[PDB]
Write a protein that binds this ligand. Structure first.
Ligand SMILES: *[C@@H]1O[C@H](CO)[C@@H](O)[C@H](O)[C@H]1NC(C)=O
Lengths: 38, 48
């Protein structure tokens, strides 16, 4: 669609280094460490 | 009108009077063969 259309005129989009799974893992680690150790 | 791309038969329902096609970007992405009445899709060859 429009997002794909832009791709065809020398405009490109790169993917982020960290994926949502890794972000979620970091957040869960922080939360567990907090609630178990102040 | 010239260009470059890969030609594929299109299932888009052109009306009898219409002759060309255009996209959201407003560029030629569908044409009708003159000699025979067929509608084809235009997609540029891969790049990266
Ligand atoms: C010209 O090309 C079209 C499409 O094939 C055909 O219908 C028509 O009969 C042709 N006319 C002559 C004189 O060859």
């Amino acid at each position: 669609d429009l997002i794909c259309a832009q791709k065809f005129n020398g405009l490109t989009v790169l993917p982020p280094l960290l994926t949502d799974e890794m972000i979620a893992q970091y957040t869960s680690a922080l939360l567990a460490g907090t609630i178990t150790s102040g | 009108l010239t260009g470059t791309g890969v030609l594929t038969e299109s299932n888009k329902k052109f009306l009898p009077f219409q002759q060309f096609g255009r996209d959201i970007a407003d560029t030629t992405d569908a044409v009708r063969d003159p000699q025979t009445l067929e509608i084809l899709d235009i997609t540029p060859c891969s790049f990266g």
